[PDB]
Amino acid sequence: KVYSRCELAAAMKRLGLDNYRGYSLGNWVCAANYESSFNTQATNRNTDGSTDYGILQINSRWWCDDGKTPGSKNACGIPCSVLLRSDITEAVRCAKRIVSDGNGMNAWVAWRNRCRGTDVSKWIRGC
Ligand SMILES: [Cl-]
């Protein structure tokens, strides 16, 4: 499932991301846009044997278990497959853990490069 910008905004707001750890809804929407193009089925293979999964491209070295990432730690206590669902509940729960890990949303490289220090409220225009 690939979300539309407003459909994702509503889902993320329903699941408590607006102003979570001080990050407005637009930040989260922007991050999803650049991390995955709103695609819950997105996967990206990395050189270390990890993969980034889902709409917020959560990494399998640290956060979820994909059964094939050497040295993986599974801090969200989930199989990575639950991050490939249309239902973003598990992705949001894990994202809340990631954003609380000491660097805010800088954990998402695409957010840092493309969203941070921009006017992110445009991501919720018309929603
Ligand atoms: Cl916003």
Rounded CA separation 124/119 (Å): 11
Structure tokens at 4: 């539309």
Q: Which range of residues forms the domain containing residue 40?
A: 1-127
Q: What is the CATH number of the domain that holds 1?
A: 1.10.530.10
User: In 3D, which of 25, 57, 26, 24 has the Cα closest to residue 40?
Assistant: 57
Q: How large is the greatest C-alpha to C-alpha distance in the chain, in angstroms?
A: 44
CA 66 to ligand 1 center in whole angstroms: 33
If one counts the domains in the chain, the total is: 1
CA 115 to ligand 1 center in whole angstroms: 11
What resolution in Å is listed for this PDB structure? Answer: 1.2
Q: Which of 7, 18, 35, 87 is catalytic?
A: 35
Query: Is residue 35 annotated as part of the catalytic site, yes or no?
Result: yes
Contact criterion met (CB below 8 Å) for 2 and 40 = yes
CA 79 to ligand 1 center in whole angstroms: 30
Structure-solving method: X-ray
Outline where DSSP puts E strands in the chain: 43-45, 51-53, 58-59
Rounded CA separation 57/109 (Å): 10
- Residue 62 φ then ψ, to 5°: -115, -35
